[PDB]
A = this chain, B = another copy of it.
Amino acid sequence: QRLVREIAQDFKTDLRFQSSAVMALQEASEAYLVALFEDTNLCAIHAKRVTIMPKDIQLARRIRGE
């Protein structure tokens, strides 16, 4: 919640939030990160590694189109 408030202060001063409006953000963020890791794990396995690397993350985002 604090993080969202801080990064929202950059677009409009003195805002107010809804609890569900923050809950939806949390759900979407967790889903996005889970999907990102699900793809990154495949990248790392394709690299014949167990440990997961930031180059794997970057490859996942590049191929996905981000």
| A interface, CB within 8 angstroms of B | 39, 42-43, 46-48, 55, 59-60, 62-65
From A48, which residue of chain B is reached at the shortest CB distance?
A: B47
A55 CB, nearest partner CB in chain B, Å: 7
Which residues of B sit under 8 angstroms from A48, Cβ to Cβ?
A: 47
In the docked arrangement, what's the CA distance between A43 and B58, Å?
12
Which residues of B sit under 8 angstroms from A43, Cβ to Cβ?
A: 46, 59, 63
From A60, which residue of chain B is reached at the shortest CB distance?
A: B63
In the docked arrangement, what's the CA distance between A2 and B43, Å?
38
Which residues of B sit under 8 angstroms from A62, Cβ to Cβ?
A: 42
The residue in A42, A43, A46, A65 that gathers the most chain B C-beta atoms within 10 A of its C-beta is: A46
